Amino acid sequence: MSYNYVVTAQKPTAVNGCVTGHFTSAEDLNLLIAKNTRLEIYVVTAEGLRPVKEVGMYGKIAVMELFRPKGESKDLLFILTAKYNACILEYKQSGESIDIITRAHGNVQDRIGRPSETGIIGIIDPECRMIGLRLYDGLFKVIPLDRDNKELKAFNIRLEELHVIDVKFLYGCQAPTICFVYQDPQGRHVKTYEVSLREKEFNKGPWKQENVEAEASMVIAVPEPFGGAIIIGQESITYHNGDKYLAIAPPIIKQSTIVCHNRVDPNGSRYLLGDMEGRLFMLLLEKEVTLKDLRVELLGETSIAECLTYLDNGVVFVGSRLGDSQLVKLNVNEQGSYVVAMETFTNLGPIVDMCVVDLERQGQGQLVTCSGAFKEGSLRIIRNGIGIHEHASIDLPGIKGLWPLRSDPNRETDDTLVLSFVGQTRVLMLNGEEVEETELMGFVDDQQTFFCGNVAHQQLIQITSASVRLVSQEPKALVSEWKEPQAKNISVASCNSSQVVVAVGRALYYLQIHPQELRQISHTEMEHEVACLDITPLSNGLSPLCAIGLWTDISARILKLPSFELLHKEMLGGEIIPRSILMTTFESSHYLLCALGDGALFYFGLNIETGLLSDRKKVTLGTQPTVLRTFRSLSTTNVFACSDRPTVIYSSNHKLVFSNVNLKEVNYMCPLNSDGYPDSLALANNSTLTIGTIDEIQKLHIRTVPLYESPRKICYQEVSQCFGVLSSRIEVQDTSGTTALRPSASTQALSSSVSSSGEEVEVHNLLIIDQHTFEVLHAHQFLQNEYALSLVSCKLGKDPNTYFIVGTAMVYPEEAEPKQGRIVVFQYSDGKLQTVAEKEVKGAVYSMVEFNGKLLASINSTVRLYEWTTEKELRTECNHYNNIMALYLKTKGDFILVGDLMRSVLLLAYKPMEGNFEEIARDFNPNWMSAVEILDDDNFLGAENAFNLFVCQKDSAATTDEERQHLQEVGLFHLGEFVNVFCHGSLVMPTQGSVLFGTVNGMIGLVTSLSESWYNLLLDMQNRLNKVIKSVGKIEHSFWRSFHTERKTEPATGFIDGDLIESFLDISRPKMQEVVANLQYDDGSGMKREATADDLIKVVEELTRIHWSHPQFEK
Template sequence: MLYAAQAQPPTAQLSAVQCRLFSPTRSALVVNKLDRIECSELQDDDAQSLVLVCTVPVHGAVAAIQPVHLPHHDTASLVVLTTSLRLFVLARAADQPYTLETVSSISIEEPFGRLDDYQSILVDPQTRCLAVHAYAGLLRVIPLVEPATAARSMHVGEPANDDDNEDQAEVAAYPDGPINLDHNFSVRLPSLLNVHCLAFVNSDSGMAPTLACIHTDHTGSRVLTSIRLDLAEKDVLPGPLEPQTLTDQGSEVIIPVVEPRSLLIVGENTITCVRVPTSSAGLPTSPTGRTTASPHGWLTRPLPVARITAWAPMTEDEILLGDIYGKLLLVKLVYRKSSNAEQAITDLHVTDLGDVSSLSLSSFSGSFLFYVASRFGDSQLVRLDRRSNADADVGAEAELQLVASYPSLAPIIDCCLVEDEASGSSRLITCSGAYKTGSLRVVQRGVGLSEMAALVVPNVQRLWSIPEETDNGTTSLLVLGSYAETRVLRISSSRNNAADLDGDGDDLDIEEVSVLPFADPAAASATTIFAGALGDHHHLVQVRSDGVAYSSSRGDETTAVRHWKSSSGRKVTAAESCCTAQDGASSSYLLIAVEGGELEVLRAQGGELVSHGSHKFAYDIASMAVGQIGGRPVVAVGLWTCQEVHLLAVPAFEQFATLSVDSTYLICSLAIDETPSSTSTMTTTTQDGNPSRASTLLVGLGDGSLLAYDVDSQQQQQQQHSYAIRSRSNKPITLGTKPLTLANLDGGASQGVLALSERPTIVTSVRNRLTYSSVNLTDVVAAASLRLQPQKDGTTESPSSSSLLAVATSEGVVLGQLDAVRQIDIKTVPLDEDEPRRIAHDPKRRIFGVVCSRRDVDRLTGSQTVTSSVRFVRQDDYETTATHVLNEGEEAHSIASVAAGESTFFVVRVPLPDRFREGAEKNRKPLPCKQVAVWSISPEGELTSSATWSGAFIAYMLARGPSPRTLIVGDALRSVTLLEYVPPASAPMQAQLKELGKDYRARYMVAVEALSSRGGGLQRIIGAEADLNMFTLERDAQAGARDLADAGVLSAQGRWHVGEVVSRFRPSALGGGPKGVSPTSTTTTTYVQPRLVYTTAAGSIGVIAEVDTESGRILSSLERNLRSVLEPVGGLDQEAFRSYHSDKVVSPSAGFVDGSYVERFLDLSEPEQDRVLAGRSEPERVDVTREEVIALLEEMARTH
């Protein structure tokens, strides 16, 4: 059984719209990301970025989104069309903020219709109807108006027909409720079969809804025409514009203008303003019924040659245009009042504003702030800075400012996986972007650290951060502890707003300081066990094995160093500090662990540290951690010998819970997760209505494994609590092989617990389940969080704090900011507007060969020049070391790294134009796509043909086979063929490519790769085709011996609908871990082996893993039962979506588990999880416990 899950969902933004979706006063930005809809908001007018507030997963591909704001609703609804021809309406849920629910859903599929390339949803400006265009020559209309309104609009100047009352009643069946899609009808458009654009003409309530259309007729000419929609008669009437052949044959955008009623027709090199008459009478026509020249009054102005793909209104007389290359244009309408007091457009001013990302749609957000959604690169939030001189030239008074950028991997054309020997993880290098936004993206599973400063301080073993209040705001003291010395650094921000730290070391002020008690000669040379502050930071303490050294300060005065020693005279082994609050007063305490199992608590009082109590354990204390459980400060104490963890209240040392750890390894460290309850802890109520809270206790063991426990606190009576500890899983999670050290992270983009072993891992609690995100660092021995907050200086209203992370390695200390905790970390490598097309890796020289193409457009003539080159990029720093530009007319299609003896070469396939074939150089060999050839390469780079196979229609791709000397051929028509290379038996003979097996189905392959071979001579292949499916094939070497008809046949095994175009399979795993540690390592018998990583044109990254038969059965049962519990959005069925689709044939999926869907089980409440496990009947019951299922799914989630 194969487990397919997304490590990164699609990042391509196909469209974006703006509407008042959640609030009548606040606009939301709605973005179509293919398989989900994301809604974001600007928190305030001065916000510099968008905040995601809602995500709607869709079981399908979203083709179009359009907001509809009905007059009787205070918020808008979203009408959504999918590629499976499902039309549904999303509206704000009344009982839950920032939640959308489906209010209506229908299928508009026509069994014998021909799907059109142009699919869209249009809304009448008067909100009288919706028009959905999905099929060629067919329009689906959904009326939205009252019967009387429909009659007035459809029959201007005519009395309403009483016979139509029944139809009009259907039109207005639900006039005051949500949009009802059930009341619809279809109209034929027999002359509009090749539509490029449709748009409603702005009209008043006295005119019927009017559509303008650009289409291609039978002669190949672009034609502008119009139609009227008769909602009462459910018919189409002639529109006010007669068919008009457009001179600009690249015209494909219609922009309606409100006043005067006009249309802007945007082509490749012109923009034309067309006045829309109130009737069609009086227009000159040819004998064929079509005007052959521009009617009088049409206004045409030149444009820089471009393919306009997006537009957005900015003001009443200004419109933004964007082309596919990212060119942004501003069109200003010049008005003049005519003699009859009507406005007329007399001129169009076009201004080039500059370049942004390659546009798919731009949505204006107010205050000259607009959003640039892109499917070919990063999306952007851009501000148009307008100068105060309104009479100046438009170009002189407008300037683009980038406010925020939102990374996108789409489209991923090619990729390669590179193993990092130091960390044991894999890096995925993708060829992403198109047009002017191409780049390499370095994708790594885990969290990145933006380095801001690196200090060469070797042999640091421990780090502590101490906040320090100064006249310049809040700074931090960073205490560096080693075996022989203790050093102190003062770190502050040089910026007014610490949140603006951009990764430059110049933003930080770092100096080594002499601070008591650490400056004391005796203390500086001792090994520090703990460093911290007590009593509002007035007491600095240094805990050593012989006791505690401390000093107090008031203002600029610092007392002499004082000492505290244990009354028993024994050594101190561990220490922690904590703060409590009672009756509005706060107290801080220092907890000291002394040999012999004694725990003492000290309190700062009158400049002294005085004993406040003690507790005696049966065994020595191995580790301690402090935190909050149920709103109470507690200390967790781990003991030697007995493997127990005790929870005690501070400072009374009231012991309320004991936990026995089922492990033979030492309890090395403890941590209490203090992540806010909204994201991590469970909040329920007891039977008496009192609140019940749960925190997470993490236990790090000596073998590098982690145990997690939920600690429930239930308040029974005043000041009385009861606690219950339950294990999240009876199987520890292995995060390394070295003893595990836990440290709490404080604020910033990352909150949770940092687990240190070979590779650091951030443990966070999201929706009541633990997630593990590796930090892309190695050789980390200690870590500490720092918070900086500059002083308010009058220029900044509220200076914000910034959270930094200090990590100690064998070479020194690194300061930086952690990126947001997510599944993968993405870095961008720009290529100076080159488009990366193919990539290969040379591991010996640690260099990448990247095939690039560059498109330059002459804005005057429209001619496009394509230049192809090969870049050589270093693996260490991703800098381009050299570039080889190909000859004129050559365009590289593929590249491979080949080793010949001690030499390595990059082999590039370059199809030669006919005029260059005769004079081709000796090392340029013709390779027809219908033939597969094997070439040998000498150490000098000489190519020699070895074997050929000519059985392909178009050999679109090649991949190594599942066994040595085998080759997989993916054909553009003939599916998959498995070949074997047979070397020559002797020198005069030629090698052969022998056909071992073939899939005889007609499939257009887009990706192919080998799966691991099974026992018994079974060879497996996985492929992806243009119908957005994924399938597996199997060859049985012994099949011919049993049945001759099965010889040479690749039998079909699994099938699954991906919903995206797969661009590449790569063997290996995206995750990884230290050597000897599996990326899914747990102490369980479940077999989980990551096999492949795949990428798609929409920018998503997926992982395919193989699971054992029993686990596959459980996961398949969960997937089936989840369909009856999870309510699908828009009535889209997950089972139907994942079914195999191929040219009118739909087959149920088999051999695959939808991992992203199954893992939603972890987000359900316990009653819902029980419903899933119970199923709808006894045969559907999953016969395992909920804890076992959660452990299995968490293990599967770690594969991606």
């Protein structure tokens, strides 16, 4: 609506910068990584990297450089943000307390200035006299590094050369000297200048070189003793100094564009170079002291590197924007100099498209992204839950139950897993990680076990259909056996350390565990068949209550012991009988859970002495019946719920919560505290027994499905249990006439189809990827020069089939505007993709949306609506000619939101009685727009330049027809990220609505709506938090969030920053009361009483529950 809450669900993963130095101490070697708005600080260790501190800034890090001014014990850090906020930071640590303090700060933006084409360049001279900033054409800003320059005051030196490509400060010079590559009418050249510190002007530099390579783009300052500079172009690498000139152009770099570099050693005898394709090179300066020649060696392949940094021990950090980041080892006499991958780091960006699987389910929905580009392209399956580290797998099918057990009374650790099967029981012994099937004396393999385990007096119990068997630990024999008076088989079995409550049809029986004897104490008949029983002591191993579920009554009731007196009777409702029942305590407060035959779970409070339901609550846990099992996590007790959707039930603020398990269908479970598997669990499905350890806490589980090509669009087709993915791959023209660069998803599919029988070419495909295995089941190749643009998965008209529909465009280098394209309707039946129908359009099909059982498509500047007929053809119903290109298309009801690349918003309405569209409203505001979404019938969200969000609303006032057709700008916010996709979807099961967004940096965020009362409270809260929260670099949050373009800056409105709001939980108790001091809390009556810290702790806590939680950085 008009009031929105925007919060981060996954911080940016893409790496834009990486530096090494000595930040945390003079003795430590650090690795500083910039991930947009975040700075991660690691300590390089012989084994690997150790995370020490991660900070967020109210800015997009544009420059990050470590430096050591004279008199300083360890390095300082210079950061410059995209909004020209400059700062010098220092790492301060007192024991286990870490702060990043601002030594100096200030905004270095100029009132006038044309921002340079090769962007912001920030360089520091070797002597640390100054910071040199190339922000605008014709100017070189200089910030002296004097101790007293705490406001980073600077001066500009006019540069005659207007088009500078790259600049660096040289080494071994008599005064701060810059070296740069520039272009002018006579070509590309290299020039140097001295910075006169007294004059604050440029002086004639030591050397220059006119007419360098047309493509030279990188300046490398070589340190002493040689000094000078290295220039890297497209086909050549050259060295320059006052007198010397070296030039190489080796074939090894002929087909590479080098875009990054790093100095390996302090003498600068070796450099690492990375091209746009993942090749890693080593540039060596060969001495004879003097510098004699240059040599390039191809080391191997890494991820496409944005930045490289040599660490130590031949370990290189590869910072990537298009694929996962890495730690590679350079190995690098016998072999050539080569590289081996050591560690990989998840990078979800760029997220070019995404979709939600299980959106309808309350929570438990996975997000699938089209991530990366080129050889780094992949799908990323993102789900939140508790993971299980599997340690062992046993192929043993048909398991109907698992029980932990201790065959040795002198040991406290379990050493036996007993499993039941239909009409059978097997015993497995554990000797460390060695599982070996054995026989247990006194236990029968003849019958199916309903319960078994350790009981009182150093004994074991085994409850089968035939009988109840007491077994001695030392002698391993059946000391006592209880059987039904008429030999009738048991139907339900419950037991604890000293009590056994067996159910024989409708009649319950209460046996008591005694030394070498099972004493039958009580025998009663219930008014319905017994479906589930429980006697968990909540006591000295004795529970005076018994939970029992019934068939005819369909109720879960709590009875007294040993009197069988009904203390309460609660009717569950419906026609399915219960499956499991459990009495358990969460955070000293008792409960009574009840699982139904249709995966429905009921949870009520249970009075230990009274025996009655406190609150009738229900939570659907799946389709399959649920089996509840108690287990201990730490001091407290948790319950594992086995079904098609396994769940862990726990307490939080004395209230039940339901974290889902990052696992598939689990039928049975039991805790296992073996010597080889301590504090572990056993899980059983239809065919396997798994022994694993459940993770500490809920985190994101990301499955990477590499495609080795670029995924462009994704749709989910539930009926087919698969994904439709538009993808492209680059091929190079071959002599024997085009060919692939490497195998990828579209060339490695199980089955494939085609649309017809040295420069690059894009081959477009439709992949059908299985949703469980992720194998490429099929690949369809589009026509030569045909660009696949849009994709939907839907049912049309009266047709029951679900189709994959693709909108294409014919792309010819000679034609600027697309004049040809088509809509192809595909069906994935059995194992193949069939083309059902095709529709030629006279333009590009930029977008497609299923619209009320019809296909709404935007072709060029028009919006067309198609009907799917019984002859299985798309027949044109109506058209809407827009004065804009219909790039974006979103619909809600009969409304259509149409948008172009320049932020032109058009609102249309399908008139069913007229058979055409009517323009409702519009808004022209030229700015680059990257995505749009409909929030509700009246409000529209969009992402516009530069990294902003905006909300426009159709007018409430309705004064006149002109006011009715004009959209009002009600929200603006500088997000700091570039949104590629918006989609409605549930993350976790006040606020209304959920809109997720995917970005270029791999960040995933959420936009939800607020009431005016909530927005006004949180807006006040932000202004009070902005006075409490310390900002790295002393940047005002309001300046950071202000809507921004190079030309304009307006304050944010209509948006609440959830990342700032949630930081309230991390501030001190006294500071919390300063924040909430004059806040007006509204409980739901208008009576705005004063807000307390506890009111806002509960308010901000439920806000954290609407999105995925962020992981702690440091160990």
